[PDB]
Amino acid sequence: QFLNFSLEGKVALVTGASYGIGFAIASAFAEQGAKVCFNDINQELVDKGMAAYAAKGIKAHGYVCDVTDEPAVQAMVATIAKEVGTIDILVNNAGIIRRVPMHEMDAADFRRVIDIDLNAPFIVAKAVLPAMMEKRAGKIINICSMMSELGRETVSAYAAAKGGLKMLTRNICSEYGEYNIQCNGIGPGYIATPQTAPLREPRHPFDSFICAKTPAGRWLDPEELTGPAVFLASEASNAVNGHILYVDGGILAYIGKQP
Amino acid sequence: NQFLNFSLEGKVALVTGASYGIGFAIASAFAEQGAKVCFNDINQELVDKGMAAYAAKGIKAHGYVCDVTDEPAVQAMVATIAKEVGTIDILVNNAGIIRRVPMHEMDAADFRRVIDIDLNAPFIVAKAVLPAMMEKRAGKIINICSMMSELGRETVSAYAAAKGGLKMLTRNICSEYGEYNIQCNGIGPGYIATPQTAPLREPRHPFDSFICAKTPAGRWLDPEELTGPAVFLASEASNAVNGHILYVDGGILAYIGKQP
Numbered sequence: 001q002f003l004n005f006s007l008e009g010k011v012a013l014v015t016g017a018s019y020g021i022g023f024a025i026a027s028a029f030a031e032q033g034a035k036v037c038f039n040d041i042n043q044e045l046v047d048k049g050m051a052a053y054a055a056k057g058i059k060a061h062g063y064v065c066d067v068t069d070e071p072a073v074q075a076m077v078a079t080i081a082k083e084v085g086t087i088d089i090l091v092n093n094a095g096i097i098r099r100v101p102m103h104e105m106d107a108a109d110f111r112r113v114i115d116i117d118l119n120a121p122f123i124v125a126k127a128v129l130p131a132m133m134e135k136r137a138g139k140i141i142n143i144c145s146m147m148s149e150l151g152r153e154t155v156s157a158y159a160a161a162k163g164g165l166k167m168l169t170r171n172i173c174s175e176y177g178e179y180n181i182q183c184n185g186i187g188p189g190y191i192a193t194p195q196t197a198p199l200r201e202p203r204h205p206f207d208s209f210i211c212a213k214t215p216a217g218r219w220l221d222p223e224e225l226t227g228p229a230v231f232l233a234s235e236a237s238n239a240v241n242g243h244i245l246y247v248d249g250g251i252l253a254y255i256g257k258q259p
Numbered sequence: 260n261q262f263l264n265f266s267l268e269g270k271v272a273l274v275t276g277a278s279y280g281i282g283f284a285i286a287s288a289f290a291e292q293g294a295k296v297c298f299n300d301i302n303q304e305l306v307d308k309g310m311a312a313y314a315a316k317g318i319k320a321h322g323y324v325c326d327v328t329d330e331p332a333v334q335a336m337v338a339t340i341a342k343e344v345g346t347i348d349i350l351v352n353n354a355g356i357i358r359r360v361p362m363h364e365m366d367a368a369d370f371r372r373v374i375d376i377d378l379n380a381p382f383i384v385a386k387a388v389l390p391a392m393m394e395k396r397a398g399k400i401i402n403i404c405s406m407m408s409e410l411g412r413e414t415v416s417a418y419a420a421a422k423g424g425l426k427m428l429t430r431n432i433c434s435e436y437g438e439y440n441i442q443c444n445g446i447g448p449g450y451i452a453t454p455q456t457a458p459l460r461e462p463r464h465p466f467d468s469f470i471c472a473k474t475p476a477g478r479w480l481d482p483e484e485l486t487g488p489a490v491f492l493a494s495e496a497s498n499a500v501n502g503h504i505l506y507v508d509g510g511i512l513a514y515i516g517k518q519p
């Protein structure tokens with residue numbers, strides 16, 4: 001039981017898992033025997049998701065829910081509690097990136113990013129904790145970034161959020177760890193998504209720059225995050241708590257490749 | 260010697276929420292180093308109290324009633340200081356609130372407030388003062404973080420999330436505007452001996468005992484302890500210090516604790 005990475009009979013909710021990282025994590029959760037749920041912002045994105053989960057032989061329970069709407073989240077959770085069962089594994093994947101110079105950035109924009117990337121993980125975690133606290137078992141995996149440690153130009157708001165989510169992780173660990181709730185975090189490095197496929201075509205200055213910073217000397221395929229994700233959702237990581245598990249391929253440990 | 264000048268002679272400074280407490284100490288110290296001091300608070304009563312205390316130390320503080328979550332109001336406050344006193348050189352995002360509520364019982368409205376004031380506002384205020392700084396190619400932005408920028412505790416959920424975000428905000432303003440010779444650093448106060456906490460140091464108190472255990476220096480930090488660090492980060496001596504959270508804890512974050 002100290003080495004069981006099985007998620008057999010565990011209810012899982014991965015927010016924003018219609019595609020991308022969240023999808024890969026939810027797919028792998030199903031593969032480990034978890035009853036998978038997910039949500040997105042509109043019906044179109046849910047239907048696309050449901051189709052892809054079906055396409056791998058997965059009965060995903062999709063929901064149209066805005067994570068910044070607390071009443072709507074509260075409902076979504078009670079619906080999953082009714083239909084599927086009380087949530088055991090929360091993965092706050094849902095989030096948005098915005099590239100705007102900070103001095104030029106609208107106050108409305110900044111707030112949006114914080115609301116979805118920071119406050120929402122609060123709201124969703126708040127909803128699923130009463131369930132977990134009763135049964136004295138739970139997992140809450142917040143998807144942080146490398147921006148939880150490092151800043152860059154334009155991504156000011158996004159970093160502020162992810163750095164805040166990092167502490168939110170540590171605080172949910174602090175407060176609810178006694179109920180045998182493990183709240184950890186996953187910090188993806190440079191992930192090779194379909195959107196970034198152009199940047200790996202013919203010696204590209206960007207791909208060269210990334211493979212320099214990365215000791216592993218490559219981009220990380222999203223599925224690389226699934227192993228870690230399962231691990232933090234498993235009963236093997238019950239002693240891991242308040243921890244940000246960076247899956248970067250060595251970047252945060254490396255000063256860089258220098259001529 | 261311009262690498263060792265801790266003087267703030269002829270530097271305009273804005274310490275948000277500096278009617279009393281840490282912000283007050285920092286601003287009083289800034290004045291003492293020759294800074295033209297400005298501050299703001301949420302209503303006229305708190306500004307007037309503040310102005311009185313600065314006046315009582317022989318300091319001509321330029322007080323303003325401004326909410327830091329109201330961007331237009333802040334935009335205004337900055338331009339007024341630009342007009343009357345001069346373009347801002349030293350920003351200190353001191354203004355902020357603490358809220359102790361179990362996360363699962365906390366209203367979403369409450370959580371947002373704390374983030375808005377403690378995280379988003381520092382953005383708004385920094386946003387307003389940066390154009391000025393970027394022109395003159397010289398500026399200091401000091402965000403007052405906490406130990407909650409590293410460690411969580413019960414009830415202080417939202418507050419931690421805010422301060423941990425402000426920590427990265429600090430690192431990002433360093434990343435983005437460092438090239439204009441703008442140093443954005445942070446100060447992380449430990450357990451500060453405030454007037455509010457005076458009861459907790461009366462007669463062996465379990466709390467005072469617990470704090471002195473966790474603290475190597477074996478004591479509470481008087482607010483004025485933060486002033487030295489603050490001046491240092493505002494001075495031209497700390498020009499190479501950038502994106503850095505200077506924790507002023509008395510050793511707490513380095514110490515696992517006193518154990519029987």
Ligand SMILES: NC(=O)c1ccc[n+]([C@@H]2O[C@H](COP(=O)([O-])OP(=O)(O)OC[C@H]3O[C@@H](n4cnc5c(N)ncnc54)[C@H](O)[C@@H]3O)[C@@H](O)[C@H]2O)c1
Pocket residue numbers: 015016017018019020021022023039040041045065066067068092093094095096097116143144145146187188189190191192193
């Ligand atoms: N290389 C990377 O792509 C990378 C690196 C580090 C971290 N991350 C993080 O990984 C997570 C997943 O990102 P991704 O690459 O899969 O794409 P993404 O950020 O687009 O995924 C988020 C999903 O949530 C949805 N969503 C947005 N707002 C929502 C709301 N209010 N309520 C509900 N759903 C909402 C989006 O439509 C989307 O499907 C994010 O938190 C992101 O910050 C990604």
Ligand SMILES: NC(=O)c1ccc[n+]([C@@H]2O[C@H](COP(=O)([O-])OP(=O)(O)OC[C@H]3O[C@@H](n4cnc5c(N)ncnc54)[C@H](O)[C@@H]3O)[C@@H](O)[C@H]2O)c1
Pocket residue numbers: 275276277278279280281282283299300301305325326327328352353354355356357376403404405406447448449450451452453
């Ligand atoms: N032991 C401590 O007190 C301690 C420890 C670590 C960090 N800090 C941090 O240091 C800073 C200063 O602490 P403090 O005790 O001096 O002050 P405080 O926490 O009592 O509040 C700071 C000031 O900001 C003002 N303010 C609040 N909201 C405002 C708004 N919207 N617009 C304008 N002004 C507003 C308040 O009126 C107050 O005078 C805060 O960021 C606090 O979180 C304090």
